[PDB]
Design a protein around this nucleic acid. Sequence first.
RNA 1: CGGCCGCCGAGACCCCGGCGCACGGACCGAUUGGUCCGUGAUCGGGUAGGCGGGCGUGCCGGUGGCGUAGAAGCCGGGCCGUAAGGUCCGGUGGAGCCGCCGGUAUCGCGGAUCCUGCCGGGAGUAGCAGCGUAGUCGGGUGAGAAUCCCGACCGCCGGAGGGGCCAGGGUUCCACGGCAAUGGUCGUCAGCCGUGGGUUAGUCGGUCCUAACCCCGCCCGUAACUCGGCGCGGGGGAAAG
RNA 2: CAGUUCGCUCCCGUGACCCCGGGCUAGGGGUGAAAGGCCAAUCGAGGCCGGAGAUAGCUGGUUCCCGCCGAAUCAUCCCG
RNA 3: GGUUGCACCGUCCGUCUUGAAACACGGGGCAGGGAGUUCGCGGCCGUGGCGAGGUUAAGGGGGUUAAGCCCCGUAGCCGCA
RNA 4: GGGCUAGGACGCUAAGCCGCCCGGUGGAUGGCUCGGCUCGGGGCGCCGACGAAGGGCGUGGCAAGCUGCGAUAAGCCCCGGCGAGGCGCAGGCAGCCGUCGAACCGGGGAUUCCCGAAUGGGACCUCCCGCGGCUUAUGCCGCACUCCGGGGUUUAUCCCCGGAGGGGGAACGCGGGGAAUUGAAACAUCUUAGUACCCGCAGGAAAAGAAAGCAAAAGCGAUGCCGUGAGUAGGGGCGACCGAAAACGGCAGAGGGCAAACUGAACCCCGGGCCGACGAGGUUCGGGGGAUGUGGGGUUGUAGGGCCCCCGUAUGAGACCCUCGCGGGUGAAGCCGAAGUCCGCUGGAACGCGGCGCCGGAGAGGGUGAUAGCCCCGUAGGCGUAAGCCCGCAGGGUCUCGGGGGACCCUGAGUACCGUCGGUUGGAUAUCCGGCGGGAAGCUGGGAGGCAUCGGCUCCCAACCCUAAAUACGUCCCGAGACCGAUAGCGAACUAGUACCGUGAGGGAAAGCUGAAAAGCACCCCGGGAGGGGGGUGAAAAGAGCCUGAAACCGGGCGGCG
Lengths: 121, 74, 62, 204
Amino acid sequence: MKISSKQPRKQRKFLYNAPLHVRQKLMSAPLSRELREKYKVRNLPVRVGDKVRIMRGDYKGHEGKVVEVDLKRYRIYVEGATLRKTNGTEVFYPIHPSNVMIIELNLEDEKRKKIIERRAG
Amino acid sequence: MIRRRKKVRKLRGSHTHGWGCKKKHRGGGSKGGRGMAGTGKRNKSKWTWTIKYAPDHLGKRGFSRPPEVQREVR
Amino acid sequence: MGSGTATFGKRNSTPTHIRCRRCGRVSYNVKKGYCAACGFGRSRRLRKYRWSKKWKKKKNAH
Amino acid sequence: AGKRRVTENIGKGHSMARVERLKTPPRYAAFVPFARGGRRTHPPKVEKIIWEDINKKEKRLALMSAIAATANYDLVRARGHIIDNVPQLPLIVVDDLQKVQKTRETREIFKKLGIWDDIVRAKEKSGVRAGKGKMRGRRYKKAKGPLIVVGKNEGIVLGARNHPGVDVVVVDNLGVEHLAPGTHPGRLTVWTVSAIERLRELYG
RNA sequence: CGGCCGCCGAGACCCCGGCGCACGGACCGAUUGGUCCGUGAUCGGGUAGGCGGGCGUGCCGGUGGCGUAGAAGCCGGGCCGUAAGGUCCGGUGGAGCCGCCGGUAUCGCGGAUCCUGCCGGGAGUAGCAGCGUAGUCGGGUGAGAAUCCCGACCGCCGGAGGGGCCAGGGUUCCACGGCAAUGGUCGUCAGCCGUGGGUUAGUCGGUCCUAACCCCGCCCGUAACUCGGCGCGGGGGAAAG
RNA sequence: CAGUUCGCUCCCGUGACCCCGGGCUAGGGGUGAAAGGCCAAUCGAGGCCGGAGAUAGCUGGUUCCCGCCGAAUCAUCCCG
RNA sequence: GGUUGCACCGUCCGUCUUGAAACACGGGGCAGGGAGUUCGCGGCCGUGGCGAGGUUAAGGGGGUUAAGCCCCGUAGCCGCA
RNA sequence: GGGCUAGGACGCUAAGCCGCCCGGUGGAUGGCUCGGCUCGGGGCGCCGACGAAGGGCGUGGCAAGCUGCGAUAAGCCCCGGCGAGGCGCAGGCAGCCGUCGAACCGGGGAUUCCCGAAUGGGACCUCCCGCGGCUUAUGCCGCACUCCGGGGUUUAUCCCCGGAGGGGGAACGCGGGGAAUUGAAACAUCUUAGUACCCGCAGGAAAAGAAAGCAAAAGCGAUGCCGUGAGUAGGGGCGACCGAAAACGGCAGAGGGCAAACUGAACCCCGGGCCGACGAGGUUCGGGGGAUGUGGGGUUGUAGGGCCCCCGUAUGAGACCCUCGCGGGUGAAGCCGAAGUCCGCUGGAACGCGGCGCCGGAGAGGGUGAUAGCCCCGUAGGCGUAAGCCCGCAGGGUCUCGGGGGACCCUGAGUACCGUCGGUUGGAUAUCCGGCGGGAAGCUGGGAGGCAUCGGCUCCCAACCCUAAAUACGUCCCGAGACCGAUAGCGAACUAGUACCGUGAGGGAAAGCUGAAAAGCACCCCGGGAGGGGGGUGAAAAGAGCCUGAAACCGGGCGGCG
């Protein structure tokens, strides 16, 4: 018994169509378990200034810094999640934040800092 | 419950599909004129009708009451 | 007129129909001063009709 | 549709049919059913049937008929409920159960009664359907299980709508759909003492 | 032609086994249906048509299943079914899918000078001829030259196959780089493709005037107008006056 | 070559001639040296759109299977 | 099972038609699309509830996420001479 | 086996037939769906000379389209909101911006070309021009079509200040004009039908609307709308067809203003000031409108309307409007929100299987490398604010009534009604509306109850005006599906109202799918070669309209025939 869209097609339209700002809520990723308990924040929107571990895909338990987070693609580039490119260089392998877990944060900004501490937990 | 197509069939492939000769299915002519048409006709049209007592005659004769004059009783 | 259509047709050369000041379609007949499509020159109003024409493009646009 | 596509007749004297196309392209038209783009033949109308009456006397008798089916063992095993508490068809429990409206509390009680086992059945998926029509909706969903009737604590229990396949009602709202969906009665019920009393008074 | 005898020769008729129908009997089920036995010599062609049973398709609901250790779909094979159609294997494919039961319909395709889409023969044929019938040798360039360029040589044209322009077209102009496409054939050329660039006005014409004529306001008509003719008043009308 | 063309031959060729540009007249209306000709590959009443999925006793087509029964092509009436 | 030889029999299909192998009409081939439908009203049929009565419609209370079902309204219709 | 003669031999049988297999062609099929369609709930519910809708042309680093904007040109500024990457669709290269907080979202503001109702005049989307202001000039600012309202003056009706109009709009609505094919198997009355189509016009709802009603004669006291009455009465070649209402049950509910009698400038508009929270209100001062009558009274029914009296007697008490502090809820579409990413195994990747474990006033639905209640958006629950909206709390201001006594108030005109012709309707003698001719009454009166007239009986006041709400729609948002799914469904899943056609009116397509990641093809061999082949991807029947990849059909090969 719930208010719902039981239209999967309409649900898709909302995801693709969405504002750039609202997209930040989709790029969030779960905190490593100790930090997740401590702050009592289930997830947070990922940054390039953070450290991350890639937890699903071929890479599992692998770690790196987030180089870029791109909102329109819905994938992020992580250091060491790479492909080998056919000329002779190592390039990032785009992967979604749903596959990934954010092991450490970084706070050097007030907007990010204020949320995590207060209303979120 | 009976599938009309199930009877029509793709079946019978009668294609006439319970109508007969192919020529027959058409316009108003099979019907003999539209509707009640032909009852009145002096001429052949429907005279006799798909009424049991056939058709009763035309001229509703006799007169009307005003609705007011009719007391209802019960 | 009938056949010999090739032999005939040296007019059209002269133009009597354009991109309209009001609508922008191809019907502002320079000679009459009337747009066939929009009705500019003829009327203060745009040409629109029950059949229509004008409406159809607009619905189509929606 | 079919008034947005004008349709004009292409004549004779050229060894094709006298069936209408369009001006300039020879394509799809209107007033055709054979053509691409043509009318369908007998499109769905908004005047299409959508009600089937069934008498107030008749409906109540139907309701009675579906509740009676539960008392029977043979219907109950066919319906697919697997019961570990056989002489207790249907099961009546004390009035305190209705007031419970929390998922964790209503859960515990079922395991002790031996009727949690039925929900385990209802977890098994029976609506990831075959067919493309799934896309529009009505996919990735659970299945039915026990029906709980209460006397009081509003028109539904605020913790028992949670449980899989469990549909909640009161005796002042009970309908055939809940009692015997898809015309398969013998769906286990769990009754409340005041609900059985008020149903006693059968009315209509 | 008048007799006769032996044979040949149907799905008929006889005969074994099976199948359906009709009827009786029994049983089974929650409905429809099914089964078992008996009787039929006097039941079994079939268009219009009437009836009755099954099959399949799409989606919905309940129920109960399947799938990356390989779904649907596709192609060939195996098996079952009077049959409509079901089912299994191999290859291919790489995410969804069945059965049962109750429903429902923009529900089953051989034809409609059907509609649309794709494709073969025709053919390597006709056309690439007919009108005043045109090219050719050296040489240059280039991967590729009968048709690009230079010279020589041989012609047509001569109020036009030449010169300047109005309409109309609208970058087709001009340079450089090319040839997949386009050019009634090739193409290194081009009007194609790619990329850049170019139209400069006191004294040309437009613009001004006014014609045949037009419109507008006003007056008036009309049920009324985006309609209608007069009379006033103004304004517009020749890129060959 | 061409949805009305070509060559020879032929008529007219200072005219009731031809031609350009402007401008006027619109569908039971115009226009016609008047043929029912012409009014934009459409004329014994143009084209476009709508009515309109007109209606036709008339042509064509009408799609799964199986089982059972199995025709009449006559009569009376009818602008039939 | 494929293919082919051999024996025997067989003049398409669909439609028009009294008669079609036709010198009647239609079709190159293939794929897809393609035709007994909806409302009202009447006459039938099967099946089901109720019962000399029977059924609600319109509606608003109520319930629900919504909604159906539930219970409530009985106007009117038909039946009861 | 050799030689010789003869018979029959399959051995390399073109052309060609069939069956399968491989490749090609082609784009069917399935699965996929950022699209439709219909329903429901709300919203939208108008805009414009303060220049709209529609159209044209520019505008980006590179810009061909779409989308957005407008010379300040995919934008400028403020505030609030989310807040850590962005730079539209559009994954490139390059460079840029942003905590003095972007992109984005809301509200407000700046700029907003030209044409267009287009208003100074004409035009083929351009051009010209008469005033006046101002800077020395260029530059730049304001103006002159046609009503009404008021002035100016040679009162040339010539010019000035004020307010307006036009046109658009998805359907709906209201008022006008008005067919035919068809049906009646012909067809003229009838029917289609007051339909199609056409004109005028308004709003967010319209219209209707407080009885000159109804008429089961009984009983009712506005009007829409729905069900029903009823396919009834009734009309009609009395043929085909045509066709109500009253009433009932419901829904939603609301009543008020003039003319006149009697008063007669007591009045309205404009500007300025005072008093007052600069507001409401009241006061005063200069013009204009106004007796051809502003304003007061009053309105189905008359209350005596005038003038009287008697008693409560402006005694008494609301009811209505404005301001301003405070508090409350709604409202910038934003916030917060439970619980596994544990083991073993398969795989390219687990969202799988198996095993363990967990939350719920909360197992909806996408997404993610596959099929996820516990990975991420989210959910039951509660909450936020500027403008804006609604309410009460402190004041100020405005403001109501009831009887009988004489002619009772006079009480609506080309109306009512009659007569003549239509239109229309079901409307019959008994519809409604027009036209033509005639034509009342002073409530001491008139109309109505389905022919006329006369009597009784019962009801009710036309000819003046307005009216919330309940009822229409689908432009827009959301939610919904016994709907469709790319030769289908919207014209159109996209470069669509495009390409294109047509002088024009108008007509009008097709065109969806890589993969885990673009790694979108380097390096090496070959090739004139932008062509093409081998090697290079988890997998290239994943290699560039790239998922699958049918049939017709085309090559080759295999079997068989020849």
